[PDB]
Amino acid sequence: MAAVTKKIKRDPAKNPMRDLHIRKLCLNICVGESGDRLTRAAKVLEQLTGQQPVFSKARYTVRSFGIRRNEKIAVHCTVRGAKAEEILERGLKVREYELRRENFSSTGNFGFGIQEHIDLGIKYDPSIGIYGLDFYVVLGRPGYNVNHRKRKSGTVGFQHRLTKEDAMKWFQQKYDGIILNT
Amino acid sequence: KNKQYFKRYQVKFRRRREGKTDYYARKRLTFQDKNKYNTPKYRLIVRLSNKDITVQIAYARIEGDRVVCAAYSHELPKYGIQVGLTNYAAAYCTGLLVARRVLNKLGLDSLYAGCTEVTGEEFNVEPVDDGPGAFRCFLDVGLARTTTGARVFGAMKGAVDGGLNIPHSVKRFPGYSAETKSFNADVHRAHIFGQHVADYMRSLEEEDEESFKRQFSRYIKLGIRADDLEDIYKKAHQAIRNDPTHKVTAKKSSAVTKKRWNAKKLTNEQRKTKIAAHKAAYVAKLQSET
Amino acid sequence: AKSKNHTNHNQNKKAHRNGIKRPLRKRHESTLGMDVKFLINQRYARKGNLSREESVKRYNERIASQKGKPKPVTL
Amino acid sequence: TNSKGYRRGTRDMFSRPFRKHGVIPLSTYMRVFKIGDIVDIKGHGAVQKGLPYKAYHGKTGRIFNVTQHAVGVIVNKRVRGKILAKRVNVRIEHIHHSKCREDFLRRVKENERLLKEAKEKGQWVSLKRQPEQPKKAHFVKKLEEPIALAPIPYEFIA
Amino acid sequence: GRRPARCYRYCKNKPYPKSRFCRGVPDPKIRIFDLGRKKATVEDFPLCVHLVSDEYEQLSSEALEAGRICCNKYLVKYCGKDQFHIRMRLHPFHVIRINKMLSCAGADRLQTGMRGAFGKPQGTVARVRIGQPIMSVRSSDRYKAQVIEALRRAKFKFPGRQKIYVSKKWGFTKYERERYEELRDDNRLEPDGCNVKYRPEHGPIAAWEKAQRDVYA
RNA sequence: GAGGUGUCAGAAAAGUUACCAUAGGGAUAACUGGCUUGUGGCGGCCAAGCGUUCAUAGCGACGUCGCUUUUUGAUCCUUCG
RNA sequence: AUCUCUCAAAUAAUAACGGAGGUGUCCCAAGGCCAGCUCAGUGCGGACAGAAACCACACAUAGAGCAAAAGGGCAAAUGCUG
RNA sequence: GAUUAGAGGCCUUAGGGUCGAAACGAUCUUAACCUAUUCUCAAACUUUAAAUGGGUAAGAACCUUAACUUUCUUGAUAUGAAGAUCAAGGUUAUGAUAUAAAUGUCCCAGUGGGCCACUUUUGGUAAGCAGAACUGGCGCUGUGGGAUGAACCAAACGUAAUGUUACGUGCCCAAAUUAACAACUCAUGCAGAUACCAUGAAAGGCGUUGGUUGCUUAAAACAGCAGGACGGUGAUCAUGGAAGUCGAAAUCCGCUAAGGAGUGUGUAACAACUCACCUGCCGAAGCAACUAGCCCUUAAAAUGGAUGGCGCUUAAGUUGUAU
RNA sequence: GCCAACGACCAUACCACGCUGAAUACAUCGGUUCUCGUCCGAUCACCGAAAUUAAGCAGCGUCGCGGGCGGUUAGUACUUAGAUGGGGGACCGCUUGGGAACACCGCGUGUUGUUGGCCU
């Protein structure tokens, strides 16, 4: 606001550092039960990711479906680096990756539901059955650790914060999928 | 939204807004007992950065902390430490440095020679009798998690091997395995001599040349092979005990108002002339169509 | 019955009749309930006050044993 | 039909100010306090470790015993009516430094010095305070816009 | 039960507030405070006339119900059915406690000798000070006779003594009538429901700019 | 240290008397007098009205303001030799 | 017997069978301490997914929580988890 | 924490719909929601924050200077601290007060029912009731004044002379019917008359005395006694008549100094009929809405009766003052 | 004119947005063998530098929000104190003194300490 822009020639404000790197992929299964209905969903993820997953205890007893405080209804696991970008393209062929428009949170994040989890390069294994999955991919830029450190922390700004268009271009650019603007 | 938010909101302090101090160690460190009225605390700051660690001895006061002495790892290329300035072993010699950069101020150089043969045992100093009791200090790490063998404790290990009486245990020195302790002193003699940085190279001498195009590059720019790192770090210990010259500087000066530089702040007159034309420009944008 | 339970009339006319009686100004005061040494230290310095005229000069000559005190200005 | 007990009617003695909540600023622990010093008591509402009672907040008195992190002050409490000398321990943030001596201690310097410059001229001291006298006889010119300037009312119509 | 207010004519206590657990209190129908063309803008009704009091009177709310339905039913007779704005400037936000002898059925046998002395709630009241207007009628300047005579018939339902200002205001504004126009005539005042806008300058530019846009183009 | 006095600075304790008693009490009720008015009883201001029409011949809604104290109470001033 | 806000009239004190409530317990952690993390809620997203949960990113001055009444108090805690 | 009123809004929360099969094209509407306002408040609400207040200080028991002391817990001057002796210090450190103050014992007697009052205040509808905060009184206290009285206003009291004072001076009743004043006020069953205090309302009143605003008037106003007053148009609204006229949509004008689709009796038609208006007439101020002084009305209780009494009415009443 | 560490008072420092930032720096940033922690080397932990000044951060801009200050609302509101002052009452007036508050208008946008350091 009334500050002289004047464009001192160091860069055209291109991307030397705004390079839009995928931060992480987090997985979750929300199945309203426990027991074998839990741990078979647990042994989905240990072979699907290679990380030992963590469960999640429910927040409050809702009694519309009888889930209880500390009942461990749900399983979730996170993936950072060298495994996100292979799991997602596995998840995109089953997605036939022209994925619908939202699917796109305004903070530059995008996730999607899938069904029929066998087609992620795994055997059917009728001992465990089928399990419906939700995916969620969080993207970032080089620099977001400034938000998440203990010492001299701080927020980022108008940009490097990711707009939704930063998440739709980058999905249109690589992986070549259209966004299905319905 | 968020407008009478601002009338009631008040701010956490300054250095909880920057995220620098914590004010829950700051009260509890610098507290002296209020009957030993004004004899200060003399704690020991250790702050570390991406480039260069920092160790200052200080005691707080009403008007900001006084500082008796400070020693950085950037001084170390005098004493032969050219690269690798944030090792644990590079953190060792800095805490060794102030523990001899400060006893010259007190003249405590005849007494408290310290652990002259460093090997990794907790040789807290002894009060040499009939006179000067040993210098006292307490560790202030502040905002780093005190995990078992962090870089900040070699700086402490520099000081207690320098000769400063600091109470400490060993449970955050490296290699003292808490399953189960394992007073294994010798892993210091591999760490304070920096050798596991070298043995990282000796376990990477053979796999990738690009590993040397990766991390511990520029040892290759100075020919620093993975064999003589102790011989650097042994030589520093006898050379830091030569002369902490306290970094005297006699530029004196090129400092004053060069060149302007930082966009002075527009008094109300030229503020008003900015608004006077802007209101005149907007009717000029309106008088254009009519 | 109930006429007058708990009033303050005539209560500061009484308290200002044999009047309001400031405490004291005592030169020395009781050290009863002070820090208990502290006071054993001052009970040790009270005994060792031995020099009025004699040794009180003499230790300056002992300062000159280090030709004075150039060094200890720091701690 | 009561008060009783020990912290009743302290919705405003130990309320915090407008937006001075939070971490106590760390100079409060750094002040030096001596024995025989004079001191005030404003019970700090965010520190529960030995607040003064409500009958001593507002009251000044002399320190006479200092400890690790509290101070034993002597506060005059009026009872009926024989004023007692109490012996109160409080912590540090329930204490401030008085200023009531601070002006006098700069009056002792200057009356030592207004006699010190008058040590050489000799005469004369004029040390003690005076309350406000009448001013003097002046005369003042208009000099500057002669009179009237004349206020005369018209104060109702409304 | 519908207690008279010969017994409740003064500010006898520091005023009772309205709690948030005592539900069971009587629901009044004093819900109406503005009457007339309440939707008309400032340009439609420029005359404003108050009914200013002369004591620290405490008004009942029975009187304020009558003081609005009196002045409606001359101004829907002698002013035209929309040419005004009756407004109560004064809300009855207090409680009166009535310890009455509902001491029939004759065999409780402890009822009160002086045991106990709880109060019992049966309505509201509205407290007034000197120079505090109770109603204001915003209308057009033509019915000036019709409104100052409408408020005389609102006096005789209120206790106390009232005085009838015709304002130098331009309706319900804070502004003087001539001083309204001078500030109005270029950009500086903006229309609203029944009021105006006050120096939209600071800040920062576009509110100065866009309000200068539409007055230009 | 514990076992508990909650009437909580701490006796171990059911009623009745119209068959009654004593010491007293106007420190205390029933009774007159006094003060008081929720109740009792009460007449002006302003008119929405009714009054076929017509406001006020006669009444007069919501208001509002005053008046009496033999009742009803409210109190406990006076009196319990 | 006892506690909290009000009465209470800007020290503290103050009364009525005045007003609104509380107590006779509860806790081997709900006590201690060191470390880590931040809450009410709202906003955009994600198979079965509304009020449905759960994962997820931003906002979030305490509008949460702190055994219990009420009042103060607390944000790298006194809160949550270890 | 209650809370009135509307304004603005992409809205997509949208309710009716609507143009539309629905609209997903769009239209407004209505509900919220959001934005900038707005009316009124709060013993158990606060950003701000008085007066009256509460605390402490105001010098020799002071001010510095020194080196000594200590076992110590803290410290390399074996520094700090708290002290023990020396060195320097002007004129003693706001004002005004001192009927003497300080301190023991006998905690010796009595008391541990209080009432009244300003301002504050809670319960009650009120109370000469109930309960508190402050100061002063009564209790214990006479005298002067209020005719009268526990507390009001003056004043506190040894026996006397003289002189001089808050309330009063028409007579009871000492001293003014003032060789002092201006005004206000007529009161036919209570004129009014010494603060507390001995009850009184709202609203009036062409009773009277002042006022503030608004007119009209010397181109002669108001007041009283003359003239004209319909038609274009039974165009028109109204048929219980409309024709100017119970009630009128309209709607001007023509005529003309002055006549309007018209002013009048609880006159259904025409019409009679009169006002408005103008000029004649006379010619100095006039008309109205207010406002607050005293007076009045409101204003009604039981033995006979109370400005204290008589009486007073250019006062012996009331307001402002003087000797 | 700066930078880092450590602060003090703790918004004139905060928030939103936009621009700039020489050097010293700080960061961002590369890795997981060790120490070390994690479901996940993101967080911490440890190793050391290729990249970058984008962002943090620093400096500024805005009739910005807020917050700070001053005038002014105002000798106002309220209030000590006094009257055998007014009024039927509410309440008011006078005398003697103390004397605010929102709003409103303006004006400022952190000041600094100790220690090393850069010098456009």
Side-chain angles (χ1 to χ4, degrees):
Chain A
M1 175 70 185
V4 177
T5 51
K6 77 207 158 293
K7 195 51 171 194
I8 310 180
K9 184 66 178 176
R10 49 177 191 273
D11 208 59
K14 292 313 174 220
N15 280 34
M17 282 291 303
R18 318 173 152 203
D19 311 343
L20 196 38
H21 271 272
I22 165 174
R23 187 154 167 84
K24 78 190 198 195
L25 153 75
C26 179
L27 302 171
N28 184 84
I29 295 177
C30 166
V31 49
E33 279 258 22
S34 161
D36 209 350
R37 258 289 166 170
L38 203 60
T39 175
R40 276 171 302 180
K43 56 183 146 294
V44 169
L45 270 299
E46 47 82 19
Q47 49 85 30
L48 182 143
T49 76
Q51 306 182 17
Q52 280 319 297
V54 309
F55 298 89
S56 190
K57 311 202 153 208
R59 297 310 300 174
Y60 37 82
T61 315
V62 78
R63 203 175 279 260
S64 44
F65 280 77
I67 72 172
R68 305 198 288 188
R69 277 211 64 253
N70 313 309
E71 216 268 324
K72 318 187 66 163
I73 51 175
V75 185
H76 67 107
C77 162
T78 323
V79 160
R80 310 194 193 264
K83 273 182 181 195
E85 68 274 47
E86 302 96 317
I87 281 175
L88 62 87
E89 54 90 17
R90 271 187 290 278
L92 277 183
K93 305 313 145 169
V94 47
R95 205 62 261 155
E96 53 97 24
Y97 38 73
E98 328 301 317
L99 179 50
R100 302 172 75 252
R101 211 192 184 270
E102 170 260 330
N103 314 318
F104 267 108
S105 176
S106 289
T107 327
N109 292 344
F110 90 101
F112 53 94
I114 56 151
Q115 272 310 123
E116 167 36 70
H117 82 281
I118 297 313
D119 52 16
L120 286 311
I122 76 173
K123 178 53 151 173
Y124 173 64
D125 186 20
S127 59
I128 69 179
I130 203 67
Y131 271 117
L133 259 292
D134 49 279
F135 270 50
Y136 203 83
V137 195
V138 191
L139 312 172
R141 272 195 225 264
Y144 277 171
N145 306 303
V146 174
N147 212 10
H148 307 81
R149 33 182 189 159
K150 183 74 178 291
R151 196 245 191 273
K152 285 163 92 95
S153 178
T155 77
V156 195
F158 89 107
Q159 156 61 32
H160 288 221
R161 275 179 192 160
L162 313 185
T163 83
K164 186 170 49 202
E165 199 38 71
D166 314 329
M168 280 180 182
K169 174 251 288 184
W170 182 92
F171 185 50
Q172 188 190 294
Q173 183 261 359
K174 78 188 65 165
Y175 320 136
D176 305 63
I178 72 156
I179 316 100
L180 193 48
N181 275 25
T182 75
Chain B
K1 302 259 182 59
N2 303 319
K3 158 71 214 63
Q4 280 87 18
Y5 169 80
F6 275 139
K7 273 185 179 309
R8 288 178 298 122
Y9 161 85
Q10 72 153 141
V11 299
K12 322 191 288 201
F13 272 185
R14 158 83 158 284
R15 314 186 49 105
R16 199 35 194 84
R17 264 198 322 263
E18 305 169 10
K20 290 193 179 65
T21 81
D22 69 294
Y23 286 125
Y24 196 75
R26 202 58 50 175
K27 156 191 56 171
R28 306 200 302 148
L29 287 158
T30 79
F31 159 77
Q32 75 280 59
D33 306 342
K34 279 95 182 177
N35 45 30
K36 43 182 206 64
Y37 307 85
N38 219 26
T39 71
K41 272 301 299 294
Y42 300 82
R43 62 202 219 278
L44 202 151
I45 317 169
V46 177
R47 300 300 193 259
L48 167 137
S49 305
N50 293 23
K51 307 199 62 174
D52 169 76
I53 71 177
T54 297
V55 168
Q56 316 189 76
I57 303 181
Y59 45 85
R61 186 58 60 79
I62 280 187
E63 45 263 10
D65 305 8
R66 291 285 104 85
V67 164
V68 283
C69 191
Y72 312 89
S73 47
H74 212 292
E75 317 171 359
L76 302 181
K78 302 183 248 183
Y79 302 95
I81 322 291
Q82 269 63 260
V83 300
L85 310 181
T86 74
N87 303 313
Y88 183 86
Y92 174 71
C93 40
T94 307
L96 184 52
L97 205 148
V98 84
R100 293 304 159 110
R101 211 166 166 276
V102 79
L103 300 190
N104 300 346
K105 297 208 171 181
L106 312 166
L108 297 200
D109 310 327
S110 51
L111 287 195
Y112 322 117
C115 199
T116 167
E117 208 284 330
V118 294
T119 21
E121 46 272 16
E122 43 166 3
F123 267 177
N124 299 322
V125 311
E126 187 259 8
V128 184
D129 56 344
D130 61 293
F135 187 83
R136 190 54 162 270
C137 216
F138 311 113
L139 185 47
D140 164 81
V141 287
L143 273 193
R145 279 221 270 277
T146 170
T147 36
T148 304
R151 283 168 286 214
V152 312
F153 285 96
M156 164 56 49
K157 196 39 163 139
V160 291
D161 305 0
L164 296 200
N165 187 11
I166 296 105
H168 71 97
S169 161
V170 311
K171 289 190 57 192
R172 310 303 171 193
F173 274 178
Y176 288 135
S177 152
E179 45 267 22
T180 174
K181 272 193 144 41
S182 90
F183 165 45
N184 177 271
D186 53 82
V187 64
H188 278 287
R189 190 185 63 192
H191 264 285
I192 298 182
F193 291 159
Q195 319 165 358
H196 284 287
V197 178
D199 290 16
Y200 185 23
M201 322 172 74
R202 289 186 168 190
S203 41
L204 272 196
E205 190 74 28
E206 59 272 62
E207 307 199 5
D208 302 325
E209 180 47 56
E210 58 172 330
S211 90
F212 295 105
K213 269 80 199 170
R214 290 307 198 82
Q215 50 202 356
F216 40 93
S217 157
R218 297 213 198 178
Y219 295 80
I220 53 176
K221 284 193 196 164
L222 318 175
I224 317 170
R225 199 172 168 83
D227 43 359
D228 49 346
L229 280 74
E230 315 176 5
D231 216 339
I232 318 177
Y233 290 148
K234 281 178 181 172
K235 273 173 181 177
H237 297 350
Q238 46 204 5
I240 287 168
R241 297 192 189 178
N242 290 341
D243 185 23
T245 181
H246 318 278
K247 219 184 178 160
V248 306
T249 315
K251 200 192 202 291
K252 316 268 181 45
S253 177
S254 65
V256 292
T257 45
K258 306 186 173 187
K259 289 188 297 207
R260 192 267 334 270
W261 171 258
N262 294 102
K264 263 54 148 178
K265 51 184 174 301
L266 274 177
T267 87
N268 187 34
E269 212 288 326
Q270 36 200 357
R271 270 165 170 169
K272 270 176 193 158
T273 73
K274 192 207 294 195
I275 303 180
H278 207 69
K279 294 197 173 168
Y282 266 129
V283 284
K285 285 165 55 66
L286 286 167
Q287 288 139 354
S288 45
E289 71 210 346
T290 78
Chain C
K2 327 152 67 55
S3 192
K4 199 78 139 175
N5 316 43
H6 284 257
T7 318
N8 261 301
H9 290 293
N10 209 38
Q11 278 325 300
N12 281 50
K13 231 182 268 191
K14 262 162 63 169
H16 276 284
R17 202 182 306 185
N18 211 288
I20 206 70
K21 194 42 154 42
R22 287 285 181 141
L24 279 156
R25 194 186 147 129
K26 295 177 308 177
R27 325 189 78 106
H28 309 89
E29 92 288 357
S30 42
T31 76
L32 189 52
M34 281 194 57
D35 213 70
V36 204
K37 178 188 175 310
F38 195 55
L39 298 156
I40 299 176
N41 184 22
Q42 311 310 299
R43 222 198 289 149
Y44 291 161
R46 209 181 305 114
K47 317 190 297 188
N49 276 127
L50 87 167
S51 183
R52 184 170 85 87
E53 46 213 355
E54 55 287 29
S55 306
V56 277
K57 54 100 170 169
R58 302 199 179 113
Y59 295 84
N60 169 49
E61 299 82 302
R62 265 82 78 189
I63 309 304
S65 52
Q66 329 301 316
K67 51 100 182 176
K69 270 151 179 316
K71 316 156 280 288
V73 310
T74 56
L75 214 159
Chain D
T1 61
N2 196 35
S3 153
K4 283 168 197 189
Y6 312 166
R7 215 192 156 157
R8 174 262 161 194
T10 82
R11 209 195 204 215
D12 285 83
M13 300 259 281
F14 304 133
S15 280
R16 276 326 283 163
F18 196 33
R19 311 186 279 103
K20 274 193 63 198
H21 280 234
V23 168
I24 308 102
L26 290 182
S27 72
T28 71
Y29 309 95
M30 298 296 315
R31 308 188 266 171
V32 54
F33 280 128
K34 275 190 206 39
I35 295 151
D37 209 311
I38 311 172
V39 101
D40 304 334
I41 295 160
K42 332 176 191 312
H44 192 296
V47 165
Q48 292 98 292
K49 292 278 181 71
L51 281 152
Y53 271 44
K54 55 176 191 299
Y56 299 104
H57 162 270
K59 292 169 193 309
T60 90
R62 278 204 218 199
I63 300 173
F64 270 107
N65 176 50
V66 314
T67 38
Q68 308 180 355
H69 36 281
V71 151
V73 193
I74 301 187
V75 180
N76 292 356
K77 174 147 155 205
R78 181 222 194 273
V79 196
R80 42 137 199 86
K82 60 194 280 179
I83 275 163
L84 304 200
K86 300 303 286 261
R87 265 156 197 252
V88 191
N89 319 320
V90 285
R91 281 216 162 171
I92 300 304
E93 45 265 37
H94 316 321
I95 264 178
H96 291 69
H97 260 309
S98 311
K99 302 272 181 273
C100 69
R101 285 298 278 233
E102 177 217 1
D103 166 271
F104 170 71
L105 267 289
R106 286 187 209 102
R107 210 59 157 86
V108 150
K109 284 184 176 67
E110 297 301 312
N111 289 272
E112 196 203 12
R113 195 194 55 75
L114 262 299
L115 167 59
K116 173 64 169 187
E117 56 89 28
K119 221 161 157 196
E120 298 94 24
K121 82 187 304 299
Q123 86 285 352
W124 191 73
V125 281
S126 157
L127 302 153
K128 74 183 74 158
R129 269 177 274 159
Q130 277 313 303
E132 178 205 343
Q133 311 298 121
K135 301 185 305 290
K136 223 168 287 198
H138 328 104
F139 44 76
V140 49
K141 199 183 164 123
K142 275 83 73 165
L143 67 74
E144 189 216 336
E145 283 86 28
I147 212 72
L149 313 154
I152 288 267
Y154 214 78
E155 301 221 335
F156 189 45
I157 175 168
Chain E
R2 292 174 229 246
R3 181 86 179 283
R6 31 173 294 176
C7 304
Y8 294 134
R9 212 195 320 154
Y10 303 79
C11 274
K12 193 38 174 73
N13 300 320
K14 335 188 289 298
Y16 279 115
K18 314 225 173 177
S19 74
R20 56 171 303 171
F21 304 102
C22 75
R23 287 193 261 131
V25 287
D27 193 19
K29 288 314 285 158
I30 306 101
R31 323 297 311 283
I32 317 184
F33 283 80
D34 294 359
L35 268 186
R37 259 210 283 141
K38 56 177 74 175
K39 312 196 60 170
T41 184
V42 289
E43 283 293 328
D44 310 341
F45 296 140
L47 170 63
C48 175
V49 169
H50 325 276
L51 184 78
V52 169
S53 187
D54 288 327
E55 309 164 335
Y56 287 173
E57 181 52 82
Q58 172 165 123
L59 291 189
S60 47
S61 176
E62 277 74 27
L64 278 175
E65 292 159 82
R68 170 210 47 233
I69 72 170
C70 74
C71 265
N72 212 6
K73 285 137 62 78
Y74 307 97
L75 298 186
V76 295
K77 255 162 211 158
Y78 309 121
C79 201
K81 64 102 175 180
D82 75 317
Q83 282 269 354
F84 57 93
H85 197 191
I86 321 161
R87 162 173 262 203
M88 322 310 277
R89 307 201 56 213
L90 211 142
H91 295 250
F93 275 147
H94 311 285
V95 199
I96 304 168
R97 331 278 204 162
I98 291 95
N99 222 332
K100 181 254 172 161
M101 289 310 161
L102 277 158
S103 315
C104 207
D108 181 74
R109 258 164 284 118
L110 45 106
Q111 271 157 343
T112 280
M114 208 56 200
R115 55 192 87 263
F118 289 81
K120 293 182 58 225
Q122 308 217 102
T124 69
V125 89
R127 314 164 194 242
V128 158
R129 78 163 87 215
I130 305 163
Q132 169 167 34
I134 324 166
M135 304 199 324
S136 275
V137 210
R138 192 201 46 182
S139 171
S140 89
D141 317 77
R142 303 176 280 107
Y143 306 93
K144 152 159 286 180
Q146 321 294 113
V147 59
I148 66 190
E149 292 176 18
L151 294 190
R152 310 272 154 115
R153 307 137 172 81
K155 293 164 104 152
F156 303 115
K157 316 286 180 166
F158 294 142
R161 173 170 160 185
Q162 284 82 10
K163 262 201 178 163
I164 290 187
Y165 272 71
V166 293
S167 44
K168 290 186 215 59
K169 303 285 176 179
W170 204 77
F172 282 175
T173 172
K174 291 183 181 167
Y175 288 121
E176 193 262 354
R177 161 173 315 265
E178 303 261 354
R179 205 189 307 127
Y180 158 75
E181 320 277 340
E182 313 156 41
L183 308 166
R184 194 268 314 273
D185 272 333
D186 41 1
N187 36 14
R188 301 183 178 278
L189 316 182
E190 298 180 8
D192 289 309
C194 274
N195 37 3
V196 295
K197 215 195 200 288
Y198 290 75
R199 295 297 100 87
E201 48 182 9
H202 322 301
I205 176 65
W208 175 89
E209 210 273 336
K210 285 307 291 165
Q212 214 200 32
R213 282 304 191 86
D214 48 1
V215 296
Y216 194 88

